Design a protein around this nucleic acid. Sequence first.
RNA 1: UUGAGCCUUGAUGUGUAGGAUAGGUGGGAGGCUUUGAAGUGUGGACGCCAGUCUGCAUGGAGCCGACCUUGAAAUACCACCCUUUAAUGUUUGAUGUUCUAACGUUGACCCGUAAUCCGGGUUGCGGACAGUGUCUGGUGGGUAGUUUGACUGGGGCGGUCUCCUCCUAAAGAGUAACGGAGGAGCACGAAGGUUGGCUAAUCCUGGUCGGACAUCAGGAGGUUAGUGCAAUGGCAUAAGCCAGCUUGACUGCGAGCGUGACGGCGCGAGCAGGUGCGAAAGCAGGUCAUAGUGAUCCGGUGGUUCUGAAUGGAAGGGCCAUC
RNA 2: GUUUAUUAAAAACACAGCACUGUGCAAACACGAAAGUGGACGUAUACGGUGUGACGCCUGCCCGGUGCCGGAAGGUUAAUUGAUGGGGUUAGCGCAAGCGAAGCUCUUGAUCGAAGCCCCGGUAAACGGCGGCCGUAACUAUAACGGUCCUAAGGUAGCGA
RNA 3: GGUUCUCCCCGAAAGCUAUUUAGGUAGCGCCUCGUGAAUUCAUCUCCGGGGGUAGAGCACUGUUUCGGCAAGGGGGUCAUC
RNA 4: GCGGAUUUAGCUCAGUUGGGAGAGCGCCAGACUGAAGAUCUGGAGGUCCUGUGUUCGAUCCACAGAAUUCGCACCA
RNA 5: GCGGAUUUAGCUCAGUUGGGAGAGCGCCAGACUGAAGAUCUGGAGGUCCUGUGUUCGAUCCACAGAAUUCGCACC
Lengths: 213, 54
Amino acid sequence: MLADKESLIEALKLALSTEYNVKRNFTQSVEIILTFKGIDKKGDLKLREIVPLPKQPSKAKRVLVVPSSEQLEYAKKASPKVVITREELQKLQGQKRPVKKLARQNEWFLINQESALAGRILGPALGPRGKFPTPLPNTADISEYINRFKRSVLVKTKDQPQVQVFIGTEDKPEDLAENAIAVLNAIENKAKVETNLRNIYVKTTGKAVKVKR
Amino acid sequence: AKGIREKIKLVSSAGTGHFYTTTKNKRTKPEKLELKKFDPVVRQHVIYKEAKIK
RNA sequence: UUGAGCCUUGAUGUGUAGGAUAGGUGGGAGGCUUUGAAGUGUGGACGCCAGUCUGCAUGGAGCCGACCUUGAAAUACCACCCUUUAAUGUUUGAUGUUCUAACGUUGACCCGUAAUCCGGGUUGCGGACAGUGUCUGGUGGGUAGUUUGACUGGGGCGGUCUCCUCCUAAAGAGUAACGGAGGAGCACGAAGGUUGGCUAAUCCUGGUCGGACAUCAGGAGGUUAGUGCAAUGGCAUAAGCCAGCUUGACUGCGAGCGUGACGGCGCGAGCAGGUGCGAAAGCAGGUCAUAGUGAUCCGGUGGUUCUGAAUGGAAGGGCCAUC
RNA sequence: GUUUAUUAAAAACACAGCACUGUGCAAACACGAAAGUGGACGUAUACGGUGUGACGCCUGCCCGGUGCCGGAAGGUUAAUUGAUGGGGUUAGCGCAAGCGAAGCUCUUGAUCGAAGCCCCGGUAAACGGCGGCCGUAACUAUAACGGUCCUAAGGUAGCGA
RNA sequence: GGUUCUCCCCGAAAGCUAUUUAGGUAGCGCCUCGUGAAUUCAUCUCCGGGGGUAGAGCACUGUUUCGGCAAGGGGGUCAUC
RNA sequence: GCGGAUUUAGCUCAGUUGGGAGAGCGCCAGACUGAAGAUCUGGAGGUCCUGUGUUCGAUCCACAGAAUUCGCACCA
RNA sequence: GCGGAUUUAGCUCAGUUGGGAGAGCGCCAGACUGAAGAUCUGGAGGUCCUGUGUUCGAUCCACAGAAUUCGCACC
């Protein structure tokens, strides 16, 4: 395997100690790391793993929404990060600054099918630093599609040597290792290469733990 | 097992059932060439990869 | 002088655009600011030119960044990351090169000693040598050993018990011989099936691309045919056939038995489960079969609700795989 | 000659030179468990291998094979030395399934490595060794003269039972 | 190698498989002795067909020879072996 | 098959900036020669070992397989 | 008798998946020589022993037969 839960438990109990959680000013974060050996251009080790954290940490996710008018009155309630309507996409047709704002600081861009202008105005700003949009359901009763994306992260690499993704915050390393191994399962499920291990670490807003395994 | 143009053993385990057996195959001809549907659990003939994954 | 590690000390780069000398792998959008802390401005001295040095400012004004531009690609703020290898510290070894309280003194002077063993100190020698104790290597018939089938028209040869058919040998069975003919040291990625299919040659005569021949439509209707190495036998409502559909060749018991000397070798009414094969009647344990291995004892090995001299883990055993 | 009294009575041969050979010397041999006594009261012209076949000439040649050994340019791949990978045994981490570190230890054929020997060099006393078919002389046929065959190869330094 | 006094009936011990057999070996008898039992067992008269010991043919495949011609093949001659 | 290396012309092999794929001996032809050899020069010469992925572009980067090949497993 | 090689170019002989027939040598041509060999460059040289069968295809293999020929059987 890549790793197992206790060899990730033992190392998040290290990561959330002051040794590795060197504090700035807020309630801070932790991540699961995988760097590869023989990682090259072919395709069999390339990844995209959109993974809802099986036990969500203290700091939720940056979910943009684009509802159609009927479901809006509910989407208004799912606690979305930011919102734009099926309509007002027609006005964003040239506005670089708004686009680069949204691209750079949101994470998830949830879009109704009628909103297909969404395929045009965001790609060249978002795409280069690997975050993705997705077909929002048509229902009013929308809530677990929003809540999932409000607790998910992604295995970005398309050709480059590393993954490193958000997985926890300051308070409960044990559950956060069920988050950590879920990312590793996505990977060993998408890339049966196994011996392409350079290393497996876990990492805070700064310092990284050279994990026991 | 001992020879070259030989009737050899190969470890054929089940698609579900864990159970293994063997009797024959031969390196003399092309090899990409077997699985079956069979069952040493006997319940339902469905998937059986041979010693070989065809 | 040379092996293995470790940054105490180093250093292997110019192309354009970007007011500017851009390895990467990456997170996101902010980062420093106590005045002796930070840049930012502007001289001056060095040169293996890609290094730095030294002066003097102003300085809570804002400046570095997605934010505005450029490009192959950003740079503010942190994480992560040391090797090809040098200098020397700090762990530490080892061949040469030796000197020499090991040592050997079966070399001398001195000495107990009118003394062949022997006592012992100075010297003089070479030298970690000697010594033997295992492991690897063959070297030779320098102790010791065996006399290893039997078949024998007495021996030397040529042939067999094997496991195999036809002769030969006197029917339930057999009974060689350096005898007569010929033999197994194995066979499937199918030479695997359950339906369904039948009528083929040779030669006569036709006809693109011949010059014996190869799909052919008809003679006559002949039961004038075929056999992938070996063989003898199959025997035709074809198994030889061959195209569709596609690979049961079940896990478990069995009245009844066919029988033998411990293995063993053969199969089946009927009963279970549900097992796959089917319209229905209904069928059955795979290459055409004959030729193909272990006395068994020791081994090895993979799995486990089978155990394991008070236990509990557990050696070792049991079950049966696997040889 | 009186020699192996015992088959031969020598028709055995014990001579004796010598190229090479054992040892620069507590020298080779070691009988005896400890001798250091032969060799030595002695040096590789003392003493031992394996022999020698009066005497004096004479020992051609010929290295394919196999001896004899001796070496080091470089491969086969052992004590010796141990890259590693996999485990065991076990802290830490796990409501459990189970992950899983030092230390201790199991197990590598890591990488050197030539005794032999592929090899490289020399051996005349080291082991034995001299090939056949197709064509033949002013006569039979002698068998000088013949082209060659990757064949290791045809009676040669004599005197002729 | 060799039955150290006598007697009476069953009683060829003395052979199939063989045997890195050589008067040697595993069980075994046609044996006795002790349990046990049925028409169990044998020859006949009979039922019922497989055998191929004989025998006999010419059928096959192999052919006797003699007739009579079977686009078979020989001898002679014209001819270009 | 464990792992590495190797496979580009007839054979030995260059092939590491991914952009033109080749040298050497030998083969061939001319020159030379009297003929050849030798010298000299031009000319010849491929399953890039296999075949896809990645790439604008593949001998080249990745991988699955093979053969050539070095050491190597082994108490069924 | 069994087993085996062998009947493959003048000469010595190679050869076979099982589909071409080879080479040193010899002859001949091309020229160099008045000429010939060498050495040269091109052409050519076959009882593949026979029969039969397998087979795409037999020089080959298996089977049967001739005929040389080799060892052992023989005492």
